[model samples]
Target chain A: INSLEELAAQELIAAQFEGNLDGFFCTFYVQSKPQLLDLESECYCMDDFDCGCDRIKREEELRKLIFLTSDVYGYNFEEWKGLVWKFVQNYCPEHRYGSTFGNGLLIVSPRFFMDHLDWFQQWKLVSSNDECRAFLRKRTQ
Target chain B: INSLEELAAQELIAAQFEGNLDGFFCTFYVQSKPQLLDLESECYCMDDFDCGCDRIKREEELRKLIFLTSDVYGYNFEEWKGLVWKFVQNYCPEHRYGSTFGNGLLIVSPRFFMDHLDWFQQWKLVSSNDECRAFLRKRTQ
Candidate 1:
């Protein structure tokens, strides 16, 4: 995130998913590396500034939208938000939902986290693109 | 409690105690019989109205004081007031702390409740003056 507000927004989204920023970022980074590289090729300030901020902002925005629409009944939103921020910031990075990305931005939703238990379980086991794609395809159905 | 206001207050207190009007009135009738008889002697309202209104106002004021000071940490004051009103109204009618009459009013605090659970417990078992006096003496120490 380029600003504190953006960072907080990222925290909020990760909190909603019950995972850390790096966990989300790592999966997102792996999935969006190609698109990010394509965006970097178009960047004018390659030396002084990286285009990671630009990608982060868009990813955060998409996550915020997904988070807003997620079902969160019988939970205190404020307490949940605070705990999520703590968990995400303090914990190690890992794939939580086994989410797959698309052409532009990898659309990850709360459904991916809530519905898929195996996605979370395969965190340490799966890393290669073939394994990731197979995991996503199996979970998608 | 002769007027509609007194009747409503009685109901409010009973509701706070989680009981009905009849139960509150029955217990109150037994405990305050002597004072009530004294009030009845003061009453010229056999045909018209009684001075119970004045007494009701005073009782309400005293109850409010006791109710307000009852330890209610982490609770809404208004809600706590309502519940205390009910509990105070329904249970029994007596000076909780063996408090004697004063120039204004005899005050009792939540400390009286916390420190003297035996007083409350004895309220149900000790009906006689001798029994009450013994109970009071034991708890006061």
Candidate 2:
């Protein structure tokens, strides 16, 4: 995202940034399933993000996502955005079910980065989108 | 957290580094909840380091018995130890209740770490508080 906070509802859409922002735009890929029982499979799921295989794959995905999104990387913006769109749709749903996972992609920009930081510090007070301005009063006043 | 190999023996633990070691540690801190549902908490029952909080903390208390025992963030060794023990003896139990709201720690540790590397490649195959190495190996491996 050009701005981390650029994720706000644009009258019809919601945006979320999922990784770190040290200036370079980042991508977050997510995969989730219903709470399974097979202990081996469960173990794999629990460690998926950090496991040796999964970690390598995760890093690969981040690099790939970034490459896909950066016009400098030469992929078509529409094509990259389509890829990103599919990811966000699958990883993040309006309503998560029985412990299913939700995904997010943070198209970070200077504005969104600052807003994201502000939200973190004031999470308890900023319960919903409508209350964000009201929550800012404490800092302003 | 101890060794990655312990996951196979007791339980498995993993985390997404996201290119931030400090942030990774902090996220672990955030995800560290005293209460969680069962199946989610079952990992801590094994002698492996990946076991849940109740079990891992117990191991921390009696570190003298485990094969590979050492404290990270040595500053918190004593504190985490007390916390783990207190949890088992008071608010929780040493045994699994087969409830979703189970108690224990799902420990994930790097055999080692590197700067700016968001992913660590390591894993252990172990789970359980028992010393049944044969049974553990058969089940985990």
Candidate 3:
């Protein structure tokens, strides 16, 4: 979000992040999950942000959300936002639970990073949407 | 540990825990760590209780502390307390970092259960102090 608070808070977190930002950004593509998340699979619910596989994915979504909204990347916030929305619509298509990706995990909210110290440990934003896309795409290759 | 607030908070967590508590408790024994933790290794610290392996071990220590204090199973809190003290002396021997096992992990602080939703998911208490000892002892067995 171009919201000053979100950007400001994210910058604060980045400052306290305590390591090479590039390594942290690279981690999102690292598949920390034990199994390939069936992003294309059916949706069910029983978890929340700030913990578990759900938390990790939400954090991933949040990174994208933050990056896009801030628009520090190649695209402006609007363009980045459009990419996220269209992408989520394609994969996480269920909007019954709307948040980031319309999947109801609340990735749009940046509050968790502020609240959780460890959450911010491995966080970073790609310089541009293309780099972001490249990060995600590299996972399959 | 015998504090009603801690027990009540823990029970509330257990209720919301939403699955077989046995499985979750058993997991501590499962060694989720990628490598064997050097319990005997030197201690230089830079982590917090809410996240990382510190969180996991703290949760483990909390389970024991909560059980002993509640005396829900066997041995009254006093007896359980002595056992905890003696045991912590055995392995986590430094009092400078005194909390659970005297290692500054703050396992004695039940507040974490009250604060985090996911923290309570894998919680269970052994029926008696004897059983508790048996549970911890089983790891080597």
Candidate 4:
């Protein structure tokens, strides 16, 4: 698909292709390939210490930043993990991801779009409450 | 099966199980599916610009540094491109990059990988000088 709009128009078609194919190989041939993720694609750097103040600091900071920038509902840790996992896995096969992935810098597969719409239905599971925000702040702090 | 050492023991037998059947569907399944470049498993990142430096300046320095580094063996730009392409394609198939970085950081598939690799090989064909010091200077300078 040329644009996310085009992909959106043919969402089911993409899904149908994904279900029929065994792996990414078939789709990759038909679709464009992705480029490498270079430092220039983004300006932010997250240092994951994995523990202590340095531990979850970057991860927490990144999530908050994205959430605010999008002005969308917030997600807790587990929800973020699930959303992130399903987001990348569902769409980012070979072809779709590779097509404009290099020029675009941030590649989003059709499956990823499909899955995000699919996941959005369960938005309630991800608490957007002040309590959740407070909890995130406490833990991150 | 768990590590490279184990997989190396039975390269031929391992190959059969690795393609579509391997449980690690993210990497092996895609690798075997076949799109463009025949991606090898041993690929890795070797960025010279991760060091704190202006990118435009770094690119110029990088050209010179690699020249010096590979001068003994006559390394050219195409060879360097091939080396970088391997890193780009190799890491694109993994679920790990997505799990942590969200949908944006897609791992490129083989189709994209092959096209890019070919580009590098072609670039190598066009270059005249093999001086390797240029590549090394990018990092040290």
Please provide TM-scores computed only on chain A for all of the candidate models, following their numbering.
0.30, 0.27, 0.24, 0.22
lDDT at position B96, candidate 3: 15
- Which parts of model 2 are misplaced by more than 4 Å? A1-50, A72-141, B1-141
Residue B16 of model 4, lDDT score: 34
lDDT of 3 by residue, B1-141 (tens): 246655655566457654223421132211111122222121112222111222223433544554434333333434444444333222222111123221212133344335433532423544444555554434221
When just chain B is superposed on the true chain B, each candidate scores a TM-score of 0.30, 0.22, 0.23, 0.19
**How good is model 1 by TM-score?**
0.19
The CA lDDT at B90 in model 3 is: 25
Model 3, A1-141: lDDT tens digits are 435545655566457654322331133221111122222122122222111223223434544554434323232434443444333322321222223211212133343334434533423554444554454332321
TM (chain A), candidate 2: 0.27
Q: What lDDT score goes with residue B125 in model 1?
A: 53
**Candidate 4 regions off by >4 Å?**
A1-84, A87-99, A102-141, B1-72, B96-141
Indicate the TM-score of model 4.
0.19
Q: What is the lDDT of residue A45 in candidate 4?
A: 24
Error of 2 at A70 (Å): 3.2
Q: lDDT tens string, model 2, A16-73?
A: 3334221112232221211112111122324232222222223235434533344233
- For model 4 chain B, where is the 10-residue window of minimal lDDT? B21-30
